[PDB]
């Protein structure tokens, strides 16, 4: 043993022994306070952490002292690596403040900003509860749309500027501990190294995300045709049978899930789905026997039994007192063999599924829990999610579901009923692959400076369409940020975990399932009562992410990469089904066409000789918005108050030339006629002329 | 006669610091003893719980401590839990029974201030993690001289850092009424009724 390798050990030890006591305290303050609401338990709370955050930093300057080049044992080293992550600590206080300002302005703005109804500017609504609420359950295409551009013009017109601070801060933070950019800092989760063969480079993902991509298209077109043809039944109006779809129409705020489409898009509708709901109230279940049920399904597979200490810590009701408590489902590792569970359990199928998924959590905890202290997590950050998705999906099928008495001993499926349950799975499953692909790569450009400034918005609905098949309802320019009205993107969390932990999930299944020797589709596979896929699935979840994530992936599935196949032979059925639904339609989109692009008028304007900056594009707007007033005053009579936001400005190429259109004040809805926005340009076509200095052939409207 | 004072005289130990009784040449009435108690379970294996207290026997062995009711089911055979992992291995190749009862006011039995099990007793070392230690059927625990200053709160971690050992101990508050555990094992014949 070397003598540096020595040193080294002996420090570990003490810091693990001391860590461990110091963590407990903070997870057990936290619980305190998460079901008991109170003053007292957050001042407690905010203590018990900042005792433990010290203790970190005090560590992790003298872990500094060691020479990672001279360690040989991996694991000495790579909790050596863990334990000298600086992070934000090594800006200079004078910036780190200053991002952390930001940060907490970002995150103030989303939780607290307000839309407003123009007719009644006293009634507002907050994103939760309120505009959430209608975007997934409205069809009225108006009122879509006032929340839509409503949340985009009043809240991320305030998230643009802060965003260009935040970006350049991020990457002066990640230049001082020797990455490229920041992007390139949040690729280092899936950085492998120390094994010959399992190597994987922090560059490879973007390339291996690309790859994977490419072969999930030509399914998501097949879903994307389906819905388009239904939803021209709800909007006959507003959808072109061969283009994008539009942006405000998705189910969502953002359409990163199309399940609240569902409604719309069933394919059978007298065929409803499985809902055991009524036979657990009819058998008189009650939370605690919901939990039971979950428990005998791990240990039916040969994973061990929950501790004494679970059934009596958790909270597995809402409480009768007068506590109030946190309901969101969490599964916690407290530490020292300590695992709770904290959920509002209802007797409801939802929940029964909830549950299955928490306690996968708590499987995973327990199996690394033998590891040194730094290397208790997941493989990678995508590891976790992906092993509670695949506990769901073997208790929600029917075959499941007949062995617990939920479903009756003659039971039939029909294949009517299996479509209308593979399309509601790819409403989430395949709707958010596109979503997050497109947002990451768009980040991804920004951090490495391929996309100025100048061309954020542009860059973004060039993406949207193209990748997504998406079209925003109304232009946007450099003062609106889009992205940052998503919760991921202003609250600095990184986003790709969610499209890698949906590969790993079917990678996952199909391989216990053929443990299993399921014969059969691979949507209809249960795990139940097979102990040879339970010990596939322990030799993964007890390494922790103690060596290279790319060795515990093969563990479990046997290769080393990430493969789509799994996921494309999941959803077989339900493509065979949509290409003959598909047959008489069109797949796939164009980019060209947009809702606003029948009003829109072509100008087109050649000064060669002043720059056409943005001051001149803002008198251009201010004089249509003066022609629009002289028309409805002298033709029809009306006084309107056409300002220059009403005016929409589209397709501006570096040589002058544009399109625009006029909107009614108060309503982004109420599109002005282009006969009559003609009829006001041929009007006041005199004046237009001398504000600018050109004439009929320097300065152009097409089609007057 | 085979004399029971010693298990009335002071208060039951813990599970992982069980007391045990070796009883040879003597005549014993297991029907007095166990009717002092309220018996809440009599599971027996390779044996009657009748032909039990009826037979003669070269050696009878009976290992007692205080355990609380709801816990029962971590003591059944076959279990992997941290009770028999840690805690009490039963030792089934001879034949033996498990009862559990709980203590009436009328008997003079003290009561300890709260019941006491091992979640885990390991070693650690920053080059592999921890090394579990199991116990073995009808021994003791080896993490057992880590429990002398006992546990304050749940899950308190009592260390030694000059042998890289640790033990975890979980506390459950004192009942009413007293409960304990009694293992009872046979050999084939001294001890008859
Ligand atoms: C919820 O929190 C309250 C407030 O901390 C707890 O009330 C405390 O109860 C203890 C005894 O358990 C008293 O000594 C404290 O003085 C109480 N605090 C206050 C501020 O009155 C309450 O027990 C907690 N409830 C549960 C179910 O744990
Ligand atoms: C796993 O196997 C068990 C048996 O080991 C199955 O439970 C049995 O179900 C049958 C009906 O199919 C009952 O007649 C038996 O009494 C049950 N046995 C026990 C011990 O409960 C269980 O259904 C299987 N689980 C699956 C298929 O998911
Ligand atoms: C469900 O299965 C039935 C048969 O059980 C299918 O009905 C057949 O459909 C094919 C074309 O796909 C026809 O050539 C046959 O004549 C049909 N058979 C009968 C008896 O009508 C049905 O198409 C399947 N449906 C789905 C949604 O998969
Ligand atoms: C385990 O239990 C034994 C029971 O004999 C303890 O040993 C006795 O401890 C008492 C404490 O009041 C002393 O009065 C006795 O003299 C001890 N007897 C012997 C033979 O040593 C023992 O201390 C317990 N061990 C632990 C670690 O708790
Ligand atoms: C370790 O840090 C100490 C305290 O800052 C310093 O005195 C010493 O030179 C360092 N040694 C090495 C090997 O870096
Ligand atoms: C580190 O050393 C320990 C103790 O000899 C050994 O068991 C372990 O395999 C070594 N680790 C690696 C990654 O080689
Ligand atoms: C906006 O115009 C539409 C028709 O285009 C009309 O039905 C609606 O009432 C208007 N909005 C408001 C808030 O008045
Ligand atoms: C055992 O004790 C009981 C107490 O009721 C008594 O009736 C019985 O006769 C005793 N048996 C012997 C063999 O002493
Ligand atoms: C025995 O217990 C019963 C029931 O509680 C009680 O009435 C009786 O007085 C007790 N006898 C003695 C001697 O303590
Ligand atoms: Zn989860």
Redesign the pocket.
Known sequence: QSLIEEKAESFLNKFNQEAEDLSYQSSLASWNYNTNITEENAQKMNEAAAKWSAFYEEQSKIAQNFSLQEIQNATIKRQLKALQQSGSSALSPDKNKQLNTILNTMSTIYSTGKVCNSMNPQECFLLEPGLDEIMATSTDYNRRLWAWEGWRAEVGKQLRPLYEEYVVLKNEMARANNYEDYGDYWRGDYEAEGVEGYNYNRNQLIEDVENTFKEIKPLYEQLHAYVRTKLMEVYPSYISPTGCLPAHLLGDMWGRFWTNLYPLTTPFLQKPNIDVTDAMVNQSWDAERIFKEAEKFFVSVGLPQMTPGFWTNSMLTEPGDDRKVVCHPTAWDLGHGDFRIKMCTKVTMDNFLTAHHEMGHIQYDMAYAKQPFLLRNGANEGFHEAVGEIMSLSAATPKHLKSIGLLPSNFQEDNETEINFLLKQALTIVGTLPFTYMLEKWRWMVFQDKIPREQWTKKWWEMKREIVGVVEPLPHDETYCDPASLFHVSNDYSFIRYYTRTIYQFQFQEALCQAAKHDGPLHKCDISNSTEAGQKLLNMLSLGNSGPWTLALENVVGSRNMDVKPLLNYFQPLFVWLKEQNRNSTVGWSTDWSPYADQSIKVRISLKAYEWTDNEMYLFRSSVAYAMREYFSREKNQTVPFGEADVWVSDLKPRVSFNFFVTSPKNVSDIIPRSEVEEAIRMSRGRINDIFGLNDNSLEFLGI | ?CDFSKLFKAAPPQIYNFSRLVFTNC?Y????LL?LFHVSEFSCHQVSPSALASGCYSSLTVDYFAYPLYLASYLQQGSTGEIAQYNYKQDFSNPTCRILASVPANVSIPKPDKYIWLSQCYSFSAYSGDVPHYVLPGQYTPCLYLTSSGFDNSYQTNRDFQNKMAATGVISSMTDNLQMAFVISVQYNSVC?
């Open positions: 006669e005549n009435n297991l029907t007095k009717s009724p």
